[PDB]
Amino acid sequence: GCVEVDSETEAVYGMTFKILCISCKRRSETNAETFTEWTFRQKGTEEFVKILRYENEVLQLEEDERFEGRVVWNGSRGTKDLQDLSIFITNVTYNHSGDYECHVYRLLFFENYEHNTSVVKKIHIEVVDKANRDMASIVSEIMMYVLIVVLTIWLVAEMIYCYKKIAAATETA
Amino acid sequence: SFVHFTKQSLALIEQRIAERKSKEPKPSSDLEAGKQLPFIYGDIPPGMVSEPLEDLDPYYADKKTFIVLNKGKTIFRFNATPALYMLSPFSPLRRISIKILVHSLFSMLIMCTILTNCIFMTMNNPPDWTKNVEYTFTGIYTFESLVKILARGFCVGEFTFLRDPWNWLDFVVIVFAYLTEFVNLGNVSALRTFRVLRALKTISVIPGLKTIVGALIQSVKKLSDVMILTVFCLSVFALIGLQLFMGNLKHKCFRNSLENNETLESIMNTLESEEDFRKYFYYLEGSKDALLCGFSTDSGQCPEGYTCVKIGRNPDYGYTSFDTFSWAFLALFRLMTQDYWENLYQQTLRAAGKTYMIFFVVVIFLGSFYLINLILAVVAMAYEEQNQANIEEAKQKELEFQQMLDRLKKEQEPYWIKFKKCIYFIVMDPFVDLAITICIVLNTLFMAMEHHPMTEEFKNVLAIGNLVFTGIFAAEMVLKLIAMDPYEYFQVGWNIFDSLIVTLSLVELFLLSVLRSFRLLRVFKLAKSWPTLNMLIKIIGNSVGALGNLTLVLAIIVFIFAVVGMQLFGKSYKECVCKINDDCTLPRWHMNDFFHSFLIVFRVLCGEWIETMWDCMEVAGQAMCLIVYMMVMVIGNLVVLNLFLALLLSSFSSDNLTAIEEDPDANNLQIAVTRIKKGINYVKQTLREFILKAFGKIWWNIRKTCYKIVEHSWFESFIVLMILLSSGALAFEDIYIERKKTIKIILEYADKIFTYIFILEMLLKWIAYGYKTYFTNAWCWLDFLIVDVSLVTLVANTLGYSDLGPIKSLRTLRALRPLRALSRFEGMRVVVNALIGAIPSIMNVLLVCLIFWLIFSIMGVNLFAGKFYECINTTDGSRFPASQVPNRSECFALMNVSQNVRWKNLKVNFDNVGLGYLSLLQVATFKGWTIIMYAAVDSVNVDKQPKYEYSLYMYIYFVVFIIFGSFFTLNLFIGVIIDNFNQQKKDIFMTEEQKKYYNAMKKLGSKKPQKPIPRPGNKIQGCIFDLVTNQAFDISIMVLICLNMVTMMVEKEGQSQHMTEVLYWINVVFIILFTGECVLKLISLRHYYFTVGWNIFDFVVVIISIVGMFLADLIETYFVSPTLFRVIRLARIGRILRLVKGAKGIRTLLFALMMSLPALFNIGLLLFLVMFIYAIFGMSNFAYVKKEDGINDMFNFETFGNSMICLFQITTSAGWDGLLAPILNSKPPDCDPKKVHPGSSVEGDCGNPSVGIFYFVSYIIISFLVVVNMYIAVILENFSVA
Amino acid sequence: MEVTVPATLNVLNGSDARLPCTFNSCYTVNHKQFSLNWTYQECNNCSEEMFLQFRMKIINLKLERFQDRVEFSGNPSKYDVSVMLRNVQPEDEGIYNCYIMNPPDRHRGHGKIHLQVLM
Ligand SMILES: CC(C)CCC[C@@H](C)[C@H]1CC[C@H]2[C@@H]3CC=C4C[C@@H](OC(=O)CCC(=O)O)CC[C@]4(C)[C@H]3CC[C@]12C
Ligand SMILES: C=C(C)[C@@H]1CCC(C)=C[C@H]1c1c(O)cc(CCCCC)cc1O
Ligand SMILES: *[C@@H]1O[C@H](CO)[C@@H](O)[C@H](O)[C@H]1NC(C)=O
Ligand SMILES: *[C@@H]1O[C@H](CO)[C@@H](O)[C@H](O)[C@H]1NC(C)=O
Ligand SMILES: *[C@@H]1O[C@H](CO)[C@@H](O)[C@H](O)[C@H]1NC(C)=O
């Protein structure tokens, strides 16, 4: 069905980065009409500004110099009901370091009922030049290697001990 | 030998009797009135029949009576007292009446009358002319009761009309008929109901049914302790369910807006209609009840604009609930019988939470498994005793008869034959017979090849092939009629059977779609050489033969129930029909007609009663429907079970006796096999002859080390721990693994250590034993195979190619990892070994069942070849009326103008033999069978729009299949299991470690009587022993616990605070009294309390009671927690659980339990392994199919918990078609191959039909087998215990 | 849809005439949609006169031929919609037809009573 996956925070200068704001309904059989708004506040600024608006399968970027022709839609497509408000950056820079807001507005249609709700998703992005490996993977790899090494050491120690044991037993008998 | 009972004879007999009475044994069954004529005098002179004769009995000689004859064995004793006091026994009126009563034409007259009346009550709205028939019917019933009274008397004395209990019914019906003839009282339906009692006159007149009914009544009366124990257990579990769930099914989702500032209470006073409810609450599309809710996070959720409330009516018309003790008992009975229990399971889980599936697991294990099983095992012992006594007495009677015969013997002391000779041996040699058998098999394979989308060259090929086959068979019959004796050709049942088949085939040729199925009957000719098809033939023949009276009784019972249901509620279904149908027309299942009433009765017998009961209670009141349905179950199920058990025992023992050798007559197949073997051997020897004519202790010093390395408990424990870890790591690969980066990485690296460790273990074993030992062991082969799969996956991933399809499937095969656990666990391995040895035993019966199901599948294919196609409005799924789109051409023409139209076809249908096999599996399991019946009975033709009930009488096809391939085949399976148990010279589910404490615990039940406590004489203390020593304090305590049970039942949902306080204080008083008894028992049984298990149970019960009340009032005042409060206020039931004491009908049950738990635990371990593997593979594959049918937002394969919930649900086969239906989608417009799933890249939203079918057929087969052995273990343990 | 009505009722001139029109339906009687039409005709083939109706509440058309002598004496909830005719006149002799529509049932409940005015 749907899964709510938080985005990543390691955009690398000169490369591409996908910001995924996934907001999904509590019941998937429902009919909705969803649109979204993204606002961005740099590391060195106070107020959030609006950067793009996506409604009815048309993307509208604001007159913004830090995103002019550098962000394209990479969310749900072909539908008026959106459960994936992702966007794509085709050339990451250092002005793309800051905090993003993903405002998603949902209008659910039930029997003689029209509910208007809202969600907000906060995404923090720090831009680097070399993607540093994460502590989880580094520690896991080191631990797997040390565990293999210690297991092998224990096994070989026991083999040599048993060889000496059985040689002594055979010589005794 | 017998005087005519003259005037002087009667006078002298009366004088002697009177003299003996003034001066002031048992009857013999051999000639009791109504049995037969004793052979003491053999025949009787023909010059005297039906005349009052001297009573042929010394015991009744001292009484006043006489005897009559009817030209037959039957003899009836008539009272010599005057009929009504104005009719002497010598009066010609009485003599003529006796003659008529004894004549057999009289009995045949009654038979004709009552059977015609039975055919007449089948009518639903009889016309005017039936009143004349009814009048003549009541007249004919008169002149028979009158004859009976004129022969014996009304109430004169003994041997009068009314002394035999079965004549009360006739008088009752006579007076009822002639009372309602003129007097106007009561409603029509109630009056018309009572004429069904005239059907019991069938039991009265037809011989044998009297004895059968008497035996059934005696058996029911014998069955009392099991019934009361079952009621008590259902009551205890109903109390548990009522406490845990109470108003939980009243949860719904109410709007958050409630415009016009209307409060919830202000809204739920003007809401009456479903569409009005639909505006304020949340209904799923097409559902009739509002969607259920939940407060915990594990329970169900509902949309954004809807909050959760506890107001409304319960689901299923308000009949499915736990609010009231009675409704909770109804639900617990339904869950006992497993009838539609999947809906209750899902509703309860959604309302309360998935954590409460433990309740369902426990109850399905305790009631739906154990109590039903022991009901069966207690009714089976009645048979094993009654039949033993009957055979013993029959043997004694036969021995006495033989002795009497010996005593009596001692007291006595050319034209055409010359040319017919050739055919005499040309049509009876093995070659022709084996050729005929091969032709039969080829014809079967040829006819199991038709299919719906058949091409015309194929169709005519089939036609000509069947023509050739029927010509061959007609020729082979004419070569036995014109070439052999026409009069000797009819002395063999196989000859008559073949003649019948060939005439039917000729009729079809030189002529419907049903005549072509009578060729399928020929496959029974192989029964003459296959000694399991012969066993099935014997089973069916015994059903219609020796045990035919039981079948007749069952038929009468079903007919009576159908008629009673029709009469009671047939007009209710017609008037009050908009209560149960939105279209305001009759539902599929109703009782307006006799056929439909009989279908409902058949459904209830099969085990599907609650769905129809809801509509019954909606249309025709609650009490009436409840009594009718409950009586139907209790009687019909008992009679069907009696038939099953009697037929099984007869076919097992009375039929199989090895009286003759294995085919004492030289079998043609055996002769042909011998000739073939000899010819092959000779040819091979000649060919071989012609061909020959033409032409350093180091290696040991390390191998011993490694061998001893893989022996230690340390190594074994380490590897088992690694197996557990590697298996458990698979449960985490949910659809949510993407949002758990750390755990994903740790697992992606842990699999590598696991692979390395297992490869090292494999190499160590290789060097430990060596190829000879390693590759000759199946467990080692399995482990090596799993290691190979893992190694291939690792190599592929390390070298890339991770997107390759075959490699992805091989990765999916990682779900077999847990199977490595099925070598190191002793219970698992022992159970697997015990299970493997039974496959060859049942292979033959499995093949016979496959053959029978193939015959049924071919018949079904011929009947419904591609006739389930329908024009469907996809918006709402409404089949278009046949008046608008009569066929495929018009449906397609409508596709051009409209948008949402489809010439849809059922996924499980009868298009070919495989799909027919699947449909028959669904029908035999009663899961999804109803859609198939509806589509079948709506059949019209190929490329024709189905019409409602156009082929209504195709229900008989399914009825016949259920009676034959689901009842008799199961009987055969059980029969071939029982004899397997018998062939052995001498438990095989237990391990060696469990054997020792099994033997140790054996003595626990067989314990010597406990030493009585000494009498202490001490001041006050002595009187307290005198108080608690006698059977008055104990009985008062028992009735106190009963009263406590009643005050626990009194609770309901919505009761007032006054009731709450009253019950709380009554329970406080009960706790005070129960503590008082315990303290008194302690101070009177110093140092002997705690020396009897029941006293320790009482002490712990008292303590848990006080503690439960204290924590209950503490949680209420502070730390509000409804769920934990409910759980704590559940130790009150300890008091009622203490009631099992003092009843030697529950303690033995519990001891049988505690005897069987070891084997049950081992089998459950194996079943959990299988369920774990299947759950993992389900997460792997079916985690992205469309959410439809039985797969929804709460019961899916998207997580380990959901997968295990579904697998537990279908372990019993409950709703296994609902989960399979979504998976059968392969291609659009019922699919979306390019479907985007946010948060993942698994594009595609439907599964592989082949993998789904194998999954859901294999799993149910394994579950059925495992439960069969689970039943066997407890049955054997009960056999030993009793 | 069973309607129990007397075949013929004789009422003395100047007295009160209670014509019973009772019916039986499984479904609960609800006034939001219960429908009743009371009609009068001089003969079987004569025209019918609409005087007493029930669409939502009791409505009396007060026809000139009955003036104000017709009232309601029944209860839809108790399934009796009989009316009360006071001071019966000789011209009142005729036929009364009782038409009932109780949803969701679709059958039309007809009840015919032939009232004859006695001296
Ligand atoms: C009807 C169409 C669909 C063909 C199906 C295949 C049949 C030709 C096969 C299936 C099972 C076979 C039978 C399996 C077992 C036996 C028992 C065999 O005899 C014994 O095993 C005797 C053992 C004993 O006497 O102890 C003789 C062949 C026979 C009847 C086989 C005959 C051929 C059968 C019927
Ligand atoms: C001969 C065997 C293996 C056992 C011996 C012990 C007893 C009680 C009966 C026999 C037996 C069957 O003959 C068949 C089954 C079921 C067959 C399917 C198993 C998956 C169970 C089953 O216990
Ligand atoms: C980033 O901002 C700097 C000035 O702060 C400007 O010179 C540069 O063009 C901007 N680059 C992007 C990619 O927005
Ligand atoms: C993401 O953006 C890239 C660049 O426009 C595009 O090629 C790709 O198809 C997009 N993927 C999704 C899932 O939108
Ligand atoms: C980003 O912009 C620079 C400057 O135009 C260009 O050289 C580079 O190739 C771009 N890279 C990507 C990935 O768009």
- Residues in a beta bridge with B837: none
How far, CA to CA in Å, does B453 sit from each of B211, B458, B863, B886?
Answer: 56, 10, 15, 20
Task: Give the whole-angstrom CA distance, residue B1193 versus residue B1185.
Answer: 12
Q: Which residues from chain B sit within 8 angstroms of residue A113, using beta carbons?
A: 255, 257, 279, 305
CA dihedral B305, B310, B313, B314 (to 10 degrees): 100
Q: Are the C-beta atoms of B807 and B801 separated by less than 8 Å?
A: yes
Q: How many CB atoms lie within 10 A of CB C40?
A: 21
Task: Determine the atom of ligand 4 nearest the C-alpha atom of B1236.
Answer: 13
The reply to whether ligand 5 has any atom less than 6 angstroms from the CB of A72 is: no
A45 to chain B nearest CA, in Å?
A: 30
How far, CA to CA in Å, does B1248 sit from each of A19, B257, B1220, B1224, B1227?
Answer: 34, 44, 11, 7, 10
Measure CB to CB from residue A5 to each of B704, B746, B1239 and give the nearest one: B1239
- Residues in a beta bridge with A128: A12
Q: How many CB atoms lie within 10 A of CB B563?
A: 22
Q: Which ligand is nearest to the CA of A22?
A: 4
Which residues, in sequence order, are CB contacts of B1002 under 8 Å at separation 6+? none
Touch between C and A (at least 3 CB pairs under 8 Å): no
Separation of CA C65 from chain center: 16
Tokens of B29: 């069954």
Task: Give the whole-angstrom CA distance, residue B1179 versus residue B1196.
Answer: 9
Q: Helix (H, G, I), strand (E, B), or coil: what is residue A30? A: coil
Breaks in chain A after (C-N > 2.5 angstroms): none
Task: Give the whole-angstrom CA distance, residue B223 versus residue B637.
Answer: 14
Pocket test for ligand 1, best of B443, B526, B532, B852 (most atoms within 8 A of CB): B526
Task: Give the whole-angstrom CA distance, residue B96 versus residue B102.
Answer: 10
SS (H, E, C) B1174-1218: HHHHHHHHCCCCCCCCCCCCCCCCCCHHHHHHHHHHHHCCCCHHH
Breaks in chain C after (C-N > 2.5 angstroms): none
Task: Determine the atom of ligand 1 nearest the C-alpha atom of B854.
Answer: 3
Amino acid of residue B404: M
Task: Give the whole-angstrom CA distance, residue C111 versus residue C8.
Answer: 12
Q: Are the C-beta atoms of B1177 and B1255 separated by less than 8 Å?
A: yes
Decide if C27 and B576 are in contact by the 8 Å CB cutoff.
Answer: yes
C66 to chain B nearest CA, in Å?
A: 37
Phi, psi of A51 (to 5 degrees): -115, -40
CA dihedral B353, B354, B358, B364 (to 10 degrees): 100
- How many Cα neighbours within 13 Å face the side chain of B133? 14
Q: Is C30 on the interface with B (CB under 8 A)?
A: yes
- Residues in a beta bridge with A122: A101
At how many degrees (to 10) do helices B1216-1223 and B1249-1281 cross? Answer: 160
Task: Show the CA angle centred on residue B421, arms to residues B417 and B424, nearest 5°.
Answer: 120
Q: In this structure, which residue's CA is closest to atom 8 in ligand 5?
A: A14
Q: Are the C-beta atoms of B1067 and B1044 separated by less than 8 Å?
A: yes
Task: Give the whole-angstrom CA distance, residue B811 versus residue B814.
Answer: 5
Give distance in angstroms: CA of B983 to centre of ligand 2: 11
Phi, psi of B1029 (to 5 degrees): -135, -20
Q: Are the C-beta atoms of B254 and B302 separated by less than 8 Å?
A: no
Give distance in angstroms: CA of B1137 to centre of ligand 3: 79
Q: Are the C-beta atoms of B1025 and B1016 separated by less than 8 Å?
A: yes
Q: Which residues from chain C sit within 8 angstroms of residue B272, using beta carbons?
A: 30
Q: Is C79 on the interface with B (CB under 8 A)?
A: no
Pocket of ligand 1 (CB under 6 A): B 441, 444-445, 523, 526, 529-530, 662, 847, 851, 854
Q: Tell me the residue range of the domain where B736 lies.
A: 698-831
Task: Give the whole-angstrom CA distance, residue B374 versus residue B1155.
Answer: 14
Q: How many CB atoms lie within 10 A of CB A158?
A: 15
- Residues in a beta bridge with C35: C101
> What region does A110 belong to: left with phi over 0, alpha with psi -120 to 50, or beta?
beta
Decide if B578 and C30 are in contact by the 8 Å CB cutoff.
Answer: no
Q: Is B741 on the interface with A (CB under 8 A)?
A: yes
How far, CA to CA in Å, does A96 sit from each of A60, B753, B1006?
Answer: 18, 40, 83
> B165-202 burial, b if ≥16 CB within 10 A, otherwise e?
eebebbeebbeebeebeeeeeeeeeebbbebbebbbbb
Task: Determine the atom of ligand 5 nearest the C-alpha atom of A90.
Answer: 14
Q: Are the C-beta atoms of B576 and C27 separated by less than 8 Å?
A: yes
Separation of CA B181 from chain center: 44
Amino acid of residue B460: N
Q: Helix (H, G, I), strand (E, B), or coil: what is residue B307? A: strand
Task: Show the CA angle centred on residue B971, arms to residues B967 and B976, nearest 5°.
Answer: 150
- Residues in a beta bridge with A124: A99
Nearest CA in chain A to B761: A155
Chains contacting C (3+ CB pairs below 8 angstroms)? B
The C residues from 37 to 76 touching B (CB cutoff 8 Å) are: none
Q: Please give the radius of gyration of chain A, using alpha carbons only, rounded to the nearest integer.
A: 27
Amino acid of residue B574: K
Q: Running DSSP on this structure, what letter comes out for residue A12?
A: B
Q: Please give the radius of gyration of chain C, using alpha carbons only, rounded to the nearest integer.
A: 14
Question: Which of C2, C4, C26 is the best mutation test for B, with the most CBs of B within 10 A?
Answer: C26
B1134 to chain A nearest CA, in Å?
A: 41
Q: Are the C-beta atoms of C108 and C1 separated by less than 8 Å?
A: yes
Q: Are the C-beta atoms of B649 and B642 separated by less than 8 Å?
A: no
Every domain of chain C and the residues it spans: 1-119
Nearest CA in chain B to C27: B576
CA dihedral B780, B782, B784, B787 (to 10 degrees): -140
- End-to-end CA separation in angstroms for chain B: 53
The reply to whether ligand 5 has any atom less than 6 angstroms from the CB of A69 is: no
Q: In this structure, which residue's CA is closest to atom 30 in ligand 1?
A: B530
Residue-by-residue DSSP string for B202-261: HHHHSTTHHHHHHHHHHHHHH--HHHHHHHHHHHHHHHHHHHH-SSGGG-EEEES--TTT
> B967-983 burial, b if ≥16 CB within 10 A, otherwise e?
bbbebbbbbbbeeeeee
Separation of CA B996 from chain center: 37
How far, CA to CA in Å, does B605 sit from each of A145, B633, B1264?
Answer: 65, 7, 21
Largest CA distance in chain A: 95
Q: Which residues from chain C sit within 8 angstroms of residue B575, using beta carbons?
A: 25-26, 105
B1214 to chain A nearest CA, in Å?
A: 25
Q: Are the C-beta atoms of B80 and B10 separated by less than 8 Å?
A: yes
Q: Is the dihedral of CA C30, C32, C34, C36 positive or negative?
A: positive
Pocket test for ligand 5, best of A13, A67, A89, A91 (most atoms within 8 A of CB): A91
Nearest CA in chain C to B583: C104
SS (H, E, C) B1034-1080: HHHHHHHHHHHHHHHHCCCCCCCHHHHHHHHHHHHHHHHHHHHHHHH
Q: Which residues from chain B sit within 8 angstroms of residue C27, using beta carbons?
A: 576, 578-579
Which residues, in sequence order, are CB contacts of B1161 under 8 Å at separation 6+? B827
- Residues in a beta bridge with C110: C99
Decide if B749 and A136 are in contact by the 8 Å CB cutoff.
Answer: no
- End-to-end CA separation in angstroms for chain A: 70
Largest CA distance in chain C: 44
Q: Please give the radius of gyration of chain B, using alpha carbons only, rounded to the nearest integer.
A: 38
Breaks in chain B after (C-N > 2.5 angstroms): 24, 413, 511, 695, 986
Which residues, in sequence order, are CB contacts of B453 under 8 Å at separation 6+? B866, B911
Question: Which of B578, B616, B618 is the best mutation test for C, with the most CBs of C within 10 A?
Answer: B578
Q: Helix (H, G, I), strand (E, B), or coil: what is residue A54? A: strand
Amino acid of residue B594: F
H or E element at residue B813: none
Per DSSP, helices labelled H in B510-569 are 533-544, 548-568
Q: Are the C-beta atoms of B786 and B820 separated by less than 8 Å?
A: yes
Nearest CA to A111 among B1243, B280, B286? Answer: B280
> By what method was this entry solved?
cryo-EM
How far, CA to CA in Å, does B466 sit from each of B461, B506, B1255, C22?
Answer: 9, 12, 37, 68
What domain count does chain A have? 1
Chains contacting B (3+ CB pairs below 8 angstroms)? A, C
SS (H, E, C) chain C: CEEECCCEEEEECCCCEEECCEEECCCCCCCCCCEEEEEEECCCCCCEEEEEEECCCEEECCCCCCCCCEEECCECCCCECCEEECCCCHHHCEEEEEEEECCCCCCCEEEEEEEEEEC
Q: How many CB atoms lie within 10 A of CB A160?
A: 11
Nearest CA to B256 among B195, B319, B307, B313? Answer: B307
Tokens of B27: 């009857």
Sheet holding A87-89, edge to edge: A17-19, A87-89, A71-73
Which is it for strands C83-85 and B902-904: parallel, antiparallel or unpaired?
A: unpaired
Q: Which ligand is nearest to the CA of A91?
A: 5
Resolution of the experimentally solved model in angstroms: 2.8
Tokens of B1096: 């320790």
B309 to chain C nearest CA, in Å?
A: 28
CATH number, domain at B718? 1.10.287.70
Amino acid of residue B139: G
Q: Is C26 on the interface with B (CB under 8 A)?
A: yes
Q: How many CB atoms lie within 10 A of CB B812?
A: 14
Q: Running DSSP on this structure, what letter comes out for residue B817?
A: G
Separation of CA B633 from chain center: 12
> Exposed, middle or buried by CB within 10 Å (0-12, 13-18, 19+), for B712?
exposed
The reply to whether ligand 4 has any atom less than 6 angstroms from the CB of A7 is: no
CA dihedral B307, B311, B317, B323 (to 10 degrees): 120
Give distance in angstroms: CA of B309 to centre of ligand 1: 65
Tokens of B161: 């009309």
Task: Give the whole-angstrom CA distance, residue A10 versus residue B1105.
Answer: 60
Q: In this structure, which residue's CA is closest to atom 13 in ligand 4?
A: A74
Q: Tell me the residue range of the domain where A33 lies.
A: 1-173
Pocket test for ligand 2, best of B976, B1272, B1275, B1277 (most atoms within 8 A of CB): B1272
Measure CB to CB from residue B584 to each of C25, C26, C106 and give the nearest one: C106
H or E element at residue B78: strand B75-79
Q: Which residues from chain B sit within 8 angstroms of residue C106, using beta carbons?
A: 584
Nearest CA in chain A to B291: A27
Give the number of beta-carbon pairs within 8 Å between A and B.
115
How far, CA to CA in Å, does B365 sit from each of B236, B658, B677?
Answer: 15, 41, 54
Task: Give the whole-angstrom CA distance, residue B365 versus residue B1209.
Answer: 13
Task: Give the whole-angstrom CA distance, residue B581 versus residue B851.
Answer: 42
Touch between C and B (at least 3 CB pairs under 8 Å): yes
Q: Are the C-beta atoms of A31 and A109 separated by less than 8 Å?
A: yes
Upstream peptide bond of B1229 is cis (omega within 30 degrees of 0): yes
Q: Running DSSP on this structure, what letter comes out for residue B290?
A: P
